[model samples]
Target chain A: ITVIGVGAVGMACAFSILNKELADELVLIVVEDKLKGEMMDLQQGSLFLKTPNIIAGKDYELTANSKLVVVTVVKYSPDCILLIVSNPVDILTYVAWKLSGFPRVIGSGCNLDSARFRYLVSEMIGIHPSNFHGCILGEHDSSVPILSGIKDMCKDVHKKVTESAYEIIKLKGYTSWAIGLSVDLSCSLIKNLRKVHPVSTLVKGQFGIDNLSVPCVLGRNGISEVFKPKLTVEEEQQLKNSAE
Target chain B: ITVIGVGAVGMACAFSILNKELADELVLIVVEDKLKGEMMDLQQGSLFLKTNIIAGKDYELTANSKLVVVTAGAAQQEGRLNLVQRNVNIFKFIIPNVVKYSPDCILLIVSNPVDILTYVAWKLSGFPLNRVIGSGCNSARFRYLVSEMIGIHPSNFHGCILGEHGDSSVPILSGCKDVHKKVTESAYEIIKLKGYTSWAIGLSVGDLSCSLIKNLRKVHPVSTLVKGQFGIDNEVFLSVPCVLGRNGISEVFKPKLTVEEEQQLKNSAETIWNTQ
Candidate 1:
């Protein structure tokens, strides 16, 4: 696996991947304050953890024909499954899928945002989050969270999660820990083929736009199928407004 | 579980614990921009992860936790005594409150000079010697370095670093081929090359905690309050090969070592005691 931009999100994902034991060889890109040092730091764990060959490199040649390519760094691959983790993930998914010409272009979309929404809702209901599953569709920035999974309780949770980024940035920094795990979740999806989850994908003509957040089937290659969940008219219109 | 600091090492432990599904609820305490943000960020992953994360200043939130971990302290770059003194002050305020509420919970110290802090915690909390474990090196690094040098899987080999968790620490070569010098050198080698070491220790924290919650009873080199375990009777905390189970430090294992290796361990323990 090749991670391009070794920023906070990228490093967290790489660290999680190492701990999760996902890949054999890890190639980390970028050179910054102890970038090579950071790679060495991770490699130090190989004694007890998986002693996979971890190297810091430049160029796509390092990533050629790999089983999976995480766009956390740079370039493209033919036979590699692509996981895009940069911001404006859905737009990048369309551009990445268009350019890579690979069917398995998966982006870390509003999957995290939707998760935040479910957590807020579950807190009030006093129920476990595993018992809750919701969706946030359209542009990831101000995506509309579909919270009707709990009926009228949706708006309260939706409003909080939709406007959460600004509030969160004031307290911490940009959202990271959640997205880090979000990418880990994406890894599990790839590891487990034909699994259904929500992510930004290239939509056919059904929604009148491509690359909307919907329930898509993840497999060894990419998205094998996209399923449409029943949506209320107002919810569908909100999604269109989010897209526009 | 209550994680009393939201720093890098602390968060790594939190993330691993959540992923490993060791606790049903976790509370994080700290006040800082990136720290709060990291806490919020880890909290959001709750929808996918099994653990529920609660972050705030309210000590009441940490009530009835099974384990409380302390990782709030100076970075590794700080001078040894300076780091230890600063963390001791932090723990002075933390341990009392943690013990007050979760009286029965085990204390896992991950601060600098971990053996010292583990000793400090054991004294301050007045808990059983086994209940407070220091983030000891044990054999994770020893095993990893040996396995890499010999071209064998790390899990296949078992070793121990007994005594201090610092320069004076001894690598007991009782179980494996004698690569004692190489294991000690690997620590400096990584730091000289990388400037810092966190991932391995992070893995150690997670691995140690998992063993306790799951009752794995795996023998790991960890720092615990020692009392007449070996011939030396000094009351100090040092990493020795021990079984960690639900009750913490279930048994301290004594590996058969060469006469020279045994003398080195006694001297190492004496060095750490003098520092204390």
Candidate 2:
């Protein structure tokens, strides 16, 4: 749990962990007030809670036992170390893989945008999101694509990845709530429940796709599985363009 | 502010009106689970509680509005409702009052055996169990006793009363978690130099009500509502740790009662039954 930022998102994570009794000790290692009193009061209130032995401090030493470190820190550790902080982050998945020495590492990838893709696919396929358990895998930028393996059954339900972002930008502001939900789901899958997340994984050979960080499900030991459902030609060309 | 069981002790008199929050919404009514949840989720945890809707309920709807609510529950045939003695008959005295007069108002038990009475209040008030708090005051008597034994000022001793807080209750002996006054330098030993010993527990009620309502927390031995926590059928009022908020006896703390203490409580229960 290497959370570098402690804004609402960070605080929310901490609260969720504490409430869920995820960690034994927590180190809110940031330059924030950390709302010590309230946090402590809440912890003390846990006397009624079944779990115990939880303490928090700003000391990074406490974080040494961290199994998986999530760096929401500044500066994208690109090819240098692929801390992936740019467009089409699908490529940075490799950067993190190459840098972290972690056999399994991931990101939100095109999840937020892909969720939009699912929505589009839904209306086209005349099905609901509950029925469409598919994703729009690829970079975390505008030039993403909506890949539907079973495309024939649906009309041109898909759109250009770049064009979709523009559509979302036109109607909505920042899609943080959704993005945060996706990222949080991924982080939590790795921590609390040790479940899986819709993130991107590096394939042995992604054809011409140099570095792709799309949305796939990663499990317990990390990156348990990756799904490349199927891509239409246009979507395939988009992926190639994204890689280039 | 018309308290029936003032107990001549005046647990509720003119000056006892300091906890203004109780009177905030005194419309005359009873104020439940979702309500309890919302209260706790709030800043004061519903301690700074008050209701313009009225404190009593059903017929208590008559207690339209007022500044304060005094302890006016039923007591011994003609004395205090210490709850230490009679337990069963108590249910008879208090509930009818709320039913008839305060149907929708607050019932602050002023006399003793509040823990005992608290149950009565809960049953009578017909309000959610959380709204009722027993005024476990025997601990105050015990606090005085302990202070006498240790020769320390009541304010300085780690002395506290636990269990039913009645005759059968025991001192925490070990639950001495807080002692604000200086006990080491011998604050009491010095007080004894002047032939001390003043049993002025009058302030106990105001202190209880004040701390409870204002701070919206509970810190008095007024009484505790038996949640059948120890596994019995009757209502027993004694001192138990609790979270007091203005809404009135917001939360009660249930500690692990020992076996011997458990028996003592049973004995206390027996006496409560015999006397009632």
Candidate 3:
């Protein structure tokens, strides 16, 4: 159940993976397009990270028995096997789930979605957003709302704040490392079984929002547990909307 | 601004910063109690980094107009979101109003439990997760791990590793170069030492992020903000990158990953869920 992808997000995850040393053995499965070149590029990072066992190939065969899976590629699965492709995310992620067939499949969505919300919360709290505690629910796209989580988190915070995603995009075009490295960090914790991370997963109504994706406790096998913390009325409604 | 942490590592960063001229103003914010009467301690690093205005202090007076860098001491307290419960919560304990006061300071979490506390800062400070990146997020320490396993830094030094700065960090060797053919006699000596490295990182950080904090894009191995990418339950986790660090992370330099490592990482997810 190794990770599969040689694309932007996939590579980012891989970079973090090596730097993090989350696995005993690492194999790369990239698209035939630039597998060799990308592999060479990543390998050079070794001097900086000082790691080994990093390889590159364009075959899915490299990922067998991986125990876990990260989908950062594209649309269309090899079959109805629940292999979620994380690129263009929304649709491809579904494909990844259809193909991989692992009990767990994670799309690198929450990191960015949370980043957007992370920025928003900072704007709202009039403080740096790095300290904001909470998760962004629903789709990775904008329709979703970044909800305020536990702690005066939501309280003592201003609501009149507005953060235009467009402005953020304008300031920092394309967010890759912020997320690519996060994927490795997630893998680091999961591989070593050290920490808990709030990752996305398909839900079966744990939060009264049936049959949709939501953040849950991501463990080694994925989908550790999904819980709906006390969301403000607005936050809850946003979750409902995200489900839709 | 440049950063100094452990004697070796801090000096290393100082060397990198100064040799590469990463900043105009260099500040050494040591967490060691009451400045151990070391006269040239700051001067040595200042000369190495070549940036002026190097002073040591507990109060954050020098922290003003600078990126507050705390190392070896206690990792960032108010600047982290992920809590590892490992290195004591120095977050709220030391430097409480960092964000409140600095407002524009880019807090970089470099201490251990890097991701957890980094996450803690991300969540508590409520800033763009990118703004709170840490060196531990993509420690060069992995080199030590690799060297430990292989018995030494490779003669062909085209390989570079990137990822969190701890036991669970990652290292990307895809972009590795075969410097075996390129190492001249002098280069061989440089490579044979206990440790030899270029001062490109700090230079890159400045060339990429500190140029204006708007133009400096950082794309290094680190746990940035995977807002909603990897499927999991942890609120905010660190990510690797070739990102822009003007105000925060931008751009991307993700290459790809192997499947075994991929699934291993996925299977690895449970670890984070439990640890965090």
The order of the candidates by lDDT, greatest first, is: 1, 3, 2
Candidate 2 lDDT by residue in tens digits, A1-244: 3433444544554555555554555445444366455457657767755446444456656455454444341122211111222334556666666655644456556655656666666555443343344555555643344544355533234455455556766797433344444444434444533332345566545545543555334334555445554567787777677666
Off by over 4 Å in 3: A30-33, A73-85, A88-95, A123-128, A141-143, A146-175, A184-188, A191-198, A210-213, B1-276
Give each model a TM-score: 0.51, 0.36, 0.41
Q: Please give the range of 10 consecutive residues that has the lowest summed lDDT in model 1 chain B.
A: B150-159
Candidate that would win on lDDT: 1
Per-prediction CA RMSD (Å):
21.1, 20.1, 19.4
**Listing candidates in order, what is each one's chain A TM-score?**
0.87, 0.63, 0.69
| Candidate 3 C-alpha error for residue A135, in Å | 2.6
True lDDT of residue A225, candidate 2: 45
**Share of the reference A-B contacts seen in candidate 3:** 0.00
Best by TM-score: 1
lDDT of 3 by residue, B158-178 (tens): 234433333233344444122
**Candidate 1 Cα errors over 4 Å, as ranges:** A1-244, B76-79, B176-196
Candidate 3 residue-wise lDDT, A85-189, digit = tens: 354555556665665564556555555555555566656544334334455555554334444345354422222122443455588765546666656335533
Candidate 1 at residue A77, lDDT? 59
